Amino acid sequence: CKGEVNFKRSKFVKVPSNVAPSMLFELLLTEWHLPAPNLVVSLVGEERLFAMKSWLRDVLRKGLVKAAQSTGAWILTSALHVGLARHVGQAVRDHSLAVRVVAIGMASLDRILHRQLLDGTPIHYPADLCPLDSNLSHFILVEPGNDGLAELQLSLEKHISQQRTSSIQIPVLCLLVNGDPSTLERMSRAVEQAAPWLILAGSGGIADVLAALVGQPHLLVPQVTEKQFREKFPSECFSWEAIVHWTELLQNIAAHPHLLTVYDFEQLD
């Protein structure tokens, strides 16, 4: 379901979950005629409420720009970013005007604004429930469950970590930046896929608490997880049952300490 939106012509494909990742990847490559990427990195946090630490954010952006201007890599942010990712995307687009990296946006059709209009070719969306920006020069859309989208992104990741296809293997990295609680469960799905994770000490509450949780391996710590969640963003109260359920995922993730590690940036390639 290929679509071209005229605004700068931006391409996208409507693809539901449980669709061939090999076919998706090869169709995308062939369609947009991208060059084979040396490295792929994936954004995982979309808490618009958590504003980027100005100096920390500038440092991260400068480091990413410096790394990407030379080696070449690919990005996996969300489609029609409006939160924290929104502005970093426009900054990267600004950099692009003045080896090449192409940002990619993936999202579900449900939350997207004009989603009925898009499902039915100049497409203009001049919005000052998600508007698009020129950051999505190429776009990725799905219209199937939230876990479905998680497994979809996971399948794309795993298929990028594929075999020779002179064996060539393009490394994939995940960046966890002040995510939702769901991101934690999402990381679980990545833990089984052997995905090297990266988290930030000072990005936000979720990553900061994760820095302590897995580091201290506790079989049973439901009250500790409760006190932590109350410490970090106590916006909505959680049931003790769901807290034990997330504690189970904490025990599962911590069991794989090699694949992920945390570094204190406020304290690069």
Binding site: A51, K53, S54, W55
Partner: protein, 49 residues
């Protein structure tokens, strides 16, 4: 220095808002302790417009 440190501690403790921190920052500008003062203020969660 410590005087301003405690003062901004008090300002931040009561509330997180522009105007009061603005007055404290005007004081800071008076003493030209831009380094430590701006570090305390702007590295913080407070948002400026």
């Amino acid at each position: 220095t410590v005087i301003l440190k405690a003062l901004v501690k008090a300002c931040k403790s009561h509330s997180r808002d522009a105007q009061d921190y603005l007055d404290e920052l005007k004081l800071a500008v008076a003493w030209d302790r831009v380094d430590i003062a701006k570090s305390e203020i702007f590295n913080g969660d407070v948002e400026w417009k």
